[PDB]
């Protein structure tokens, strides 16, 4: 049977007791969800190929398992390997034993290695605990380093390979140098224990960790796709998210409905088929109009007895648009075919037509003693041997050179007088090699001039129309499609680009020859994973694919058999962004979630159709419907009816904004030179960039100092919270700092500075050139500033950003905040206890979230991670050789002598220089946007907290009443009050009432009606009072408007 290696394939490529930070490694890694071959019974275990990687894991009830034997032939013929367990000590033998079909010491031979260590462990992990044991092994050969891993992983589900995780660290090794291909299992069998076999791959893990130096995370690349969030996405505990995976991307889609069906013509045939060509002397010279041959059909034709090409391989057929082609036709001698080469040596090669010392695309020849040679012998051609003007290349000397000097004894007139260069050539159809007339031309090309768009006269989006071979062996290394094109033409031949080097194809007068580039098959990979945590079901998106075309590298299937990797699913769908191999496309249209594209999302509930349905969509698949924000909540036409609120609701959020880097300067020289005479002198010689960069870095340093200061010096002088915390019935209980607890952060803030993932990319971390100068305001100084913040916010008024803090209550502070938002302070003087209950209870439950909601603060953590990646990609770029023999400095200083050392170190520096300048420019972009963030943080604090701004969707949604600041390591949290009326109940009104012939309108109120009477109330609070002349005004007379009615005023 075939069982996935769900979490099997992850291990330690080398010595790393890492902790909780993100790093990648590139070695021979077993694919995830890799199907494993079972061998439980004979029905013992057939021999298998090594495949440059194999996996094993034992699931035994009791101690049975013996060792194995490794080698090419597993026989005395070839150097082999042995693995034996003595239950006392393990040994490894590289020995050559006679191959026994069934095992253990058949014949000891050539035992070059010996080793003793503790035996590889076994049972009572299988029996004593009443569970059993899963003993994973990792077998690898890289540079002969026999990479042996193991541990125990007890499980109780022996049905198949279950979930659950364990690390993998090395055991022993040998410096073999063996070429390992095949292997056997030894044990001293219809029903033997169950195990696995998983074939590995040379891949690139990223490794994340716990705090105890143990593995926790890695992913797959072009297999599992579930646990292929990538081969690098840093976590088993991924969330529901679209994760681009690998560069074997896609094949095409459908398109809009225009269609070519137009072919044109042009008489090129004479250029090669004019059965009466010119003599080799008078090499005929034609260039022709828009008409070509499918030089693939010229390549694969046996009509040409000589298909010789100087410069272009004949397998580069489609993208050939060549600017100028000069056709030069001429007869040949039977033995001159080899002599056809640019810059050759001989009589004719430079004395009848010379191709110069440069490439000549293709020169095409074939014997034609049938169409030319006659029974009397074709009799009409010549050859000029060595008695002429030496023939500069591309010269048709049609001159009759009777003499060269007319007097010299060499040729002249003395001695030889009747000599003449025009020596004629003859032959016969049946003569043999040496004088066989091959039909020979010259095809010389030009370059560097072809701006156009009509190297595409083309159309017909398709799936594909022809066999798998050579659709488009261009878009170099090639792939594509072929079909027919549709346009008219003009005298140019052979060249154009669609736009600016988008070379497409060479058009037909007869053939098919289409690209508009027929695909490089396309770009897109968008594997869906909902997370290993709450799911184990997978699907894959293929952006911009015809789903009938088996998207990835059409039915590549050169990999392990996997329903997703081996694309054959009928559970598919076609979006705008291509096929959805693991889909169950539905039209339910819930809220959007993990997105696919153009309006396709996922993540339904666990009982959509079946009990087997899970929280992840459509167990064993993934359903991706059409996106919607939901449905309508239409609002209607009120002429004067007032759906007036009598109650209201509030909620509280989290607002998260970084306010600095992890303050970092970079001594540019020390970063680069590392206090080295070589680089110190070398950079003193080289430019002044580093000085400017260090200036910029000091600027950003004092910048985050200024950001911290501005976010935490909005008030000139500090205000401690009140001693007794009994604010007009409004409990807070969580945001005031600790009165005497260590670090004096708020209870919320204690829980934050601790709940922040105290690794926080682990970044307690200066290595080289680095530094972390700590900020101006110490963490406790930020805390004290938050104290000032709450002191002003709930203790002084609208005014602690307005200078000195006052000594004023919050009962009446909230009274004046009601008073100044447009609804009188009747609200709390009625309901101070009730609004206090709502407000403080909500604020309390919000901290329950901020305690449970890890990663909901993903922006400060995100920026910590971006600086982490900044320094990390920085150091890995420091680990970029960039033109030397290695990325190290000192070795290649000493490995090579003075000139080589200095030039290689020059390259090393210049490259790492450029990398640092790119880092600092990206860091300055980040620093400008995070300056914007710091100004925005100070601005939220100021506007929303220090007073109360009118800003909308800046601190909450809508009714802005006040606001609250918080703190963090390098960012800040924020929460601010959001007020919303509710309970709409309809009530009639009117812009005017007729009474005593005058028009009556209110000052602050509206003429509300309850069905038969009319009152004046406010428009977020329905308070019934009689309409009189003390709270209203009367003026003029009833104007022209809809709604004049009775019920006069008092």
């Amino acid at each position: 049977a075939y069982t996935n290696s769900f979490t099997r394939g992850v291990y330690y490529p080398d010595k790393v007791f890492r902790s909780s930070v993100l790093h990648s490694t590139q070695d021979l890694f077993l694919p995830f969800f890799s199907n494993v071959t079972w061998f439980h019974a004979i029905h013992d275990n057939p021999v298998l190929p090594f495949n440059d990687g194999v996996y094993f894991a034992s699931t035994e009830k009791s101690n049975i398992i013996r060792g194995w034997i490794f080698g090419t032939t597993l026989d005395s013929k070839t150097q082999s390997l042995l693995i034996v367990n003595n239950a006392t000590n393990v040994v490894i033998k590289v020995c050559e034993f006679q191959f026994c079909n069934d095992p253990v010491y058949s014949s000891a031979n050539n035992c070059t290695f010996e080793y003793v260590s503790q035996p590889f462990l076994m049972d009572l992990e299988g029996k004593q605990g009443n569970f059993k044991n899963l003993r994973e092994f990792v077998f690898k050969n890289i540079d002969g380093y026999f990479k042996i891993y193991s541990k125990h992983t007890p499980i109780n589900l022996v049905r198949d390979l279950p979930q659950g995780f364990s690390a993998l660290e090395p055991l022993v090794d040998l410096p073999i140098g063996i070429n390992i291909t095949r292997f056997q299992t030894l044990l001293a069998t219809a029903g033997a224990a169950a195990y696995y076999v998983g074939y590995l791959q040379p891949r690139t893990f990223l490794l994340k960790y716990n705090e105890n130096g143990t593995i926790t995370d890695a992913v797959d690349c072009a297999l599992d796709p579930l646990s292929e969030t990538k081969c690098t996405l840093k976590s088993f505990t991924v969330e529901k998210g679209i994760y681009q995976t690998s560069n074997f991307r896609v094949q095409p889609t459908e398109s809009i409905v225009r269609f070519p069906n137009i072919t044109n013509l042009c008489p090129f045939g004479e250029v090669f088929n004019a059965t009466r060509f010119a003599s080799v002397y008078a090499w005929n010279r034609k260039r022709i109009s828009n008409c070509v041959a499918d030089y693939s059909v010229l390549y694969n034709s046996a009509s040409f007895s000589t298909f010789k090409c100087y410069g272009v391989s004949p397998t580069k057929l489609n993208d050939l648009c060549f600017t100028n082609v000069y056709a030069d036709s001429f007869v040949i001698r039977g033995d001159e075919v080899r002599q056809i080469a640019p810059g050759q040596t001989g009589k004719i090669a430079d004395y009848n037509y010379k191709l110069p010392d440069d490439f000549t695309g293709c020169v095409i020849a074939w014997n034609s003693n049938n169409l030319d040679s006659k029974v009397g012998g074709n009799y009409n051609y010549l050859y000029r041997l060595f008695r002429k003007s030496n023939l500069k290349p591309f010269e048709r000397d049609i001159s009759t050179e009777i003499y060269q000097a007319g007097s010299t004894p060499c040729n002249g007139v003395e001695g030889f007088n009747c000599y003449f260069p025009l020596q004629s050539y003859g032959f016969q159809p049946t003569n043999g090699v040496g004088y066989q007339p091959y039909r020979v031309v010259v095809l010389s090309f030009e370059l560097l001039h072809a701006p156009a768009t009509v190297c595409g006269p083309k159309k017909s989006t398709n799936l594909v129309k022809n066999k798998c071979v050579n659709f488009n062996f261009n878009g170099l290394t090639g792939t594509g499609v072929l079909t027919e094109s549709n346009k008219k033409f003009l005298p140019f031949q052979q060249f154009g680009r669609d736009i600016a080097d988008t070379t497409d194809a060479v058009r037909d007068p007869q053939t098919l020859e289409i690209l508009d580039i027929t695909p490089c098959s396309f770009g897109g990979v968008s594997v869906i994973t909902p997370g290993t945590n709450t799911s184990n079901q997978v699907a894959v998106l293929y952006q911009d694919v015809n789903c009938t075309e088996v998207p990835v590298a059409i039915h590549a299937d050169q990999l392990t058999p996997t329903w997703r990797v081996y694309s054959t699913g009928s559970n598919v769908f076609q979006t705008r962004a291509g096929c959805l191999i693991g889909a169950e496309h539905v039209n339910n249209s819930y809220e959007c979630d993990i997105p696919i594209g153009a309006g396709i999302c996922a993540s339904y509930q666990t009982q959509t159709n079946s009990p087997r349905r899970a929280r992840s969509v459509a167990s064993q698949s993934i359903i991706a419907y059409t996106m919607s924000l939901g449905a309508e909540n239409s609002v209607a036409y009120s002429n004067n009816s007032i759906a007036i609120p009598t109650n209201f609701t509030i909620s509280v959020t989290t607002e998260i904004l970084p306010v600095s880097m992890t303050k970092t300067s970079v001594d540019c020289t020390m970063y680069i030179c590392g206090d080295s005479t070589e680089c110190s002198n070398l950079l003193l010689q080289y430019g002044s960039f580093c000085t400017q960069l260090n200036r910029a870095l000091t600027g950003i340093a004092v910048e985050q100092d200024k950001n911290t200061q501005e976010v935490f010096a909005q008030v000139k002088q500090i205000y401690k919270t009140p001693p007794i915390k009994d604010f007009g019935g409004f409990n807070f209980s969580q945001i005031l700092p600790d009165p005497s607890k260590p670090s004096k952060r708020s209870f919320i803030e204690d829980l934050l500075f601790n709940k922040v993932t105290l690794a926080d990319a682990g970044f307690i971390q200066k290595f080289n050139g680095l530094t972390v100068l700590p900020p101006l305001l110490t963490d406790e100084m930020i805390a004290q500033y938050t104290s000032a913040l709450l002191a002003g916010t709930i203790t002084s008024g609208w005014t602690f950003g307005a200078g000195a803090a006052l000594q004023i209550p919050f009962a009446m502070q909230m009274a004046y905040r009601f008073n100044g938002i447009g609804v009188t302070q009747n609200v709390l003087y009625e309901n101070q206890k009730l609004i206090a209950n709502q407000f403080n209870s909500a604020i309390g439950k919000i901290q329950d979230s901020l305690s449970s909601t890890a990663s909901a603060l993903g922006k400060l953590q995100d920026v910590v991670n971006q600086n982490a990646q900044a320094l990390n990609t920085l150091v890995k770029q420091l680990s970029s050789n960039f033109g030397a023999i290695s990325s190290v400095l000192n070795d290649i200083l000493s490995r090579l002598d003075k000139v080589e050392a200095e030039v290689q170190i020059d390259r090393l520096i210049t490259g790492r220089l450029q990398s640092l300048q790119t880092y600092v420019t990206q860091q300055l972009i980040r620093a400008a946007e995070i300056r914007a963030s710091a100004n925005l943080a100070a601005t939220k604090m100021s506007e929303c907290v220090l007073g109360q701004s009118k800003r909308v969707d800046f601190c909450g949604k809508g009714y802005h009443l006040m606001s609250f600041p918080q703190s963090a390591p390098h960012g800040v949290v924020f929460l601010h009050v959001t007020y919303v009326p509710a309970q709409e109940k309809n009530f009639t009104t009117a812009p005017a009432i007729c009474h005593d012939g005058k028009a009556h309108f209110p000052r602050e109120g509206v003429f509300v009606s309850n069905g038969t009477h009319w009152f004046v109330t406010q428009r977020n609070f329905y308070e019934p009072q009689i309409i009189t002349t003390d709270n209203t005004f009367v003026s003029g007379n009833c104007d022209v408007v809809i709604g004049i009615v009775n019920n006069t005023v008092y």
Epitope: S279, Y281, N284, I398
Partner: nanobody
């Protein structure tokens, strides 16, 4: 329309003379160099004579050369080869060979017979 139609050739008894004409009917004749060629039955073809482009130089054969007489006429655009001084060694079909433009130029091939 530059297709060379050869003419003038025909039966000639030994000791006579013949005028030879050849036309690229509807296109140029003048500055194409003329070079006739004799092909003997049972033997190999042999160089006879030719002309220059300018017309001023009637560059005849290597041996005794005054036998053959050549000229160009613009007014009718064909050769005027006044053959003379026969030997029985000229019974052959000849080639117009207007080497200008396309060198080995032909398309009919006119035959002159040097009869007895």
């Amino acid at each position: 329309e530059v297709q060379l139609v050869e003419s003038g050739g025909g039966q000639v008894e030994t000791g006579g003379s013949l005028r030879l004409s050849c036309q690229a009917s509807g296109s140029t004749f003048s500055d194409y160099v003329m070079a006739w060629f004799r092909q003997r039955p049972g033997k190999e073809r042999e160089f006879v004579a030719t002309i220059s482009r300018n017309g001023g130089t009637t560059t005849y054969g290597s041996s005794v050369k005054g036998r053959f007489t050549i000229s160009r006429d613009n007014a009718k655009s064909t050769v005027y080869l006044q053959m003379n001084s026969l030997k029985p060694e000229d019974t052959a079909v000849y080639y117009c060979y207007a080497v200008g433009g396309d060198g080995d130029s032909w398309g009919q091939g006119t035959q002159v017979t040097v009869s007895s």
